[PDB]
Design a protein around this nucleic acid. Structure first.
Ligand SMILES: Nc1ccn([C@H]2C[C@H](O)[C@@H](COP(=O)(O)NP(=O)(O)OP(=O)(O)O)O2)c(=O)n1
Ligand SMILES: [Mg+2]
Ligand SMILES: [Mg+2]
Ligand code: NA
Ligand code: NA
Length: 326
DNA sequence: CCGACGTCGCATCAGC
DNA sequence: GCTGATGCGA
DNA sequence: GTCGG
């Protein structure tokens, strides 16, 4: 929390450019700058000091100078006052409602929680469930609850087929004491980069989790990625646990290390690592790491026998999950 | 200065 | 229906 | 908004 004031400011600016201006690269730029400042081990004295950090340029340095002198930012103060920006920023907090849909809802005079609730018929399925659990999705999940959820998921997965391996990644794997949601990486020996010897591999697990009333809703569902809602069982006379977002990603068993590297994150860490990979002449996704031929096409997948192997190729010293919280 | 910015899954829609 | 683009999100 | 070339 050394420079929390600055990083909060930059984060708010990031969200503005993403939601209102619809400038995804300004959003990324602000996110990058906020991240590098967050890990800077000194209380920042000036914008000039901050500008030394990669990702922090002239404009942000100026904003930091304003914030240090006054404790606020005029650009942000104005943004907070603008009705259209405020309306759009609120609407986008509903899962499924993005910058485009939010701006469209505003045009139609749909701009409040009350407006949304009396107009469910104008929402797609994702958006409708997002509204349904708007309050719950705001809530953090204590690691203690994450542990309970992990036990249920792993044990139910084991019941379907013993050869399944379920790994909880995301912020949980990085050792966070609280998480925004649950992310589960799934493998089965019948699904490799070479072939798929069994149908409905992801479907079967989802079905089982629904059958025991753990998974409660589905936002989207394909052959390799599930996005939905889950809830811990409560005891007699106890108030119910909040509903939680859960993602399940099926990844070819032989490509587990690239898969777990991706799903562990963090999101900015992945962006930074993959950017570094490009500079070193590689490209990394959740499946492979590939060389980039001089032309610009990705070459053949390189052998990967650990998360560390991926770090080695791009000449980065290995970083444990707990040190990837950027 | 200025091109490019990490990479991809699922839902949705446009055009044929 | 297929293919490709876009929106949204992980 | 930032920056490597
Ligand atoms: N922008 C993004 C979003 C998702 N991810 C892949 C890796 C992110 O760390 C990760 C899990 O997504 P997430 O749940 O939205 N974020 P994360 O799990 O790190 O922290 P929480 O908000 O759950 O506590 O998925 C990514 O690489 N880049
Ligand atoms: Mg998560
Ligand atoms: Mg998630
Ligand atoms: Na800089
Ligand atoms: Na949203």
């Amino acid at each position: 929390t050394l420079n929390g004031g600055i990083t909060d400011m930059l984060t708010e600016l990031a969200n503005f450019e993403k939601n209102v201006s619809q400038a995804i690269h300004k959003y990324n730029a602000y996110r990058k700058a906020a991240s590098v400042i967050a890990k800077y081990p000194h209380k920042i004295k000036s914008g000039a000091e901050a500008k030394k950090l990669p990702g922090v340029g002239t404009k942000i340095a100026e904003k930091i100078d304003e914030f240090l002198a006054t404790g606020k930012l005029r650009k942000l103060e104005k943004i907070r006052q603008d009705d259209t920006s405020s309306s759009i920023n609120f609407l986008t907090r509903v899962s499924g409602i993005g910058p485009s849909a939010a701006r469209k809802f505003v045009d139609e005079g749909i701009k409040t929680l009350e407006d949304l609730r009396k107009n469910e018929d104008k929402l797609n399925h994702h958006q409708r469930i997002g509204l349904k659990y708007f309050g719950d999705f705001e809530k953090r999940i204590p690691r203690e609850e994450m542990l309970q959820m992990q036990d249920i998921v792993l044990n139910e997965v084991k019941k379907v087929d013993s050869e399944y391996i379920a790994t909880v990644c995301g912020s949980f794997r990085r050792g966070a004491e609280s998480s925004g949601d649950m992310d589960v990486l799934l493998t089965h020996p019948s699904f490799t980069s070479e072939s798929t010897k069994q149908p409905k591999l992801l479907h079967q697990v989802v079905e089982q989790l629904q059958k025991v009333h753990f998974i409660t809703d589905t936002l989207s569902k394909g052959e390799t990625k599930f996005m939905g809602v889950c809830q811990l069982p409560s005891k007699n006379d106890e108030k119910e646990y909040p509903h939680r977002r859960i993602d399940i990603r099926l990844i070819p068993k032989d490509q587990y290390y690239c898969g777990v590297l991706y799903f562990t994150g963090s999101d900015i860490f992945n962006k930074n690592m993959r950017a570094h990979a490009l500079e070193k002449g590689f490209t990394i996704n959740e499946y492979t790491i590939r060389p980039l031929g001089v032309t610009g096409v990705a070459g053949e997948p390189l052998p990967v026998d650990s998360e560390k192997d991926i770090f080695d190729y791009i000449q980065w010293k290995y970083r444990e999950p707990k040190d990837r919280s950027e």
